[PDB]
Amino acid sequence: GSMRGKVSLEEAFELPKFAAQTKEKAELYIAPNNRDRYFEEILNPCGNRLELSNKHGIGYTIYSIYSPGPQGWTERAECEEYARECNDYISGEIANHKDRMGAFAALSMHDPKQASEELTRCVKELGFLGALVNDVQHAGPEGETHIFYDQPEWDIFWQTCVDLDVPFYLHPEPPFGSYLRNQYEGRKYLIGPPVSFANGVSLHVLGMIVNGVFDRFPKLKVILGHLGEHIPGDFWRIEHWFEHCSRPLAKSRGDVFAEKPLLHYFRNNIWLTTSGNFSTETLKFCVEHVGAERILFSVDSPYEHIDVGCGWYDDNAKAIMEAVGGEKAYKDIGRDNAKKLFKLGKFYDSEA
Template identity: 50%
Template structure:
């Protein structure tokens, strides 16, 4: 399939790329690490050519993990986000028919995050934002800020006003949590286990488009909330959502493959993803229920969500 839309493609400022090598080594196969380190600081070089070769018509870049969410100092995080946004905007300026970006945001101050998102959307034409599922804060970095609290209403309201999605990416375990849970289980960091455990609770706040959680657990979550937790909330006078979980997910959440490149689950690189999607076209069309749905997964849903105009092979 030509004209596929690819997103969650990581970048880092060239001056800081080497500092992310340790983090990257937890997720990247040793033979690919040097190549990855070169690619994250060169978004429009060999990576763009590879995208072309693989039939990708449009790519959306985002700041690599742990990114701004790994910076516990508020001022430093805000400055780093702004610097990263300005850099990627400059890098892709001459390639906008093929390349876009998500804003990086410091989530220490919801109002400031809303302002930076608005700046990036209106000034640079960014397609929304990508943030990790919590913000490190505090002097030791061990305070975690989650975005489902009332203080963040100003941020989510701005997202609705701008009509752009926020991609919630699972963060890697760090600090005391890493030492207690994963230091002796380091090969479970990332897709094997830690990502799945850290995608919540942020998606359970209504009134916006957010993704990165495939809803395998819908029935179980909804049953428990409706048949147990709601009754307890009514008894205790606590707040509960007015509608069931299906209502909010169907209207506000866009599901991605999230690296699950298998018709029944493989690795997460451009070559693997495109090889799977194109190589198993017939079986995917059957599994998805028709060619129209295959096209929706490959590009049409993303075109609608991100408001994409014409780009190479967008109608191929």
């Protein structure tokens, strides 16, 4: 049967004072008939989305800043102030519901040391469970400067993640600048889930892999939504090319490269969530490659509907159990993987 106490952890908010900013997101991601509900949910962490979560058997929601969030703020000082305001806000919101709400840090990713300190403040002072960062940090006019976290100066930040022993959720964001104009203006409906978001995240996390981040920090934990942002279908092709071309080519030049095969990182350092991917067939394929213990249920609210995402997992319990390898695998994906990963105490319906 279906289960209660599900953990859901790609669930976005915005600062209520910036409700006007949400309207631009609604233009990019929200059908007209879903606008009222979106605006209610994105601006009210304890509102109707909490009632829906209770109704639909979610025991624990981890909130995060929506996208791009700080990653779209191009002025370092403004970005840092905004991230702090977001963390203080969601801390105050979740304070009243500790048995069923947690949060991920919003971070300005302009400076590794400053981001490290804000993550440390969130985890150690606010009880946050990790970080959620919306892909590259944008800087300069129109955000044309793309700051990637797979370069060596970010080692001080990955060290902080490992010291705090919390995961880093690498979430997508829209295109900026010349990339937006050159490659998306003539196909604007592909901004978002259809191709742009995965294209960016997969580039970034593969960049972390091939630049040696997980070799230097073997205990680093990273989370990708959407069942791995295109990578699982290409597990064979990517590692094949690494064996056939990239690894020996890099070695011949003395260039840094991933020391281990791609699947090693997805079996040790990376977890997937089911956000916006309520697909039993895709889930099965992923399970067959990374293991049922490495995939976490999630909805992607408010861009997805809690009743739809929970409806998939609950109403199709038997078929999904068959797909993922039995009743334990099911409860694991729904709840117990996350309970273990985030070291969760007792929470709402956590043993239901």
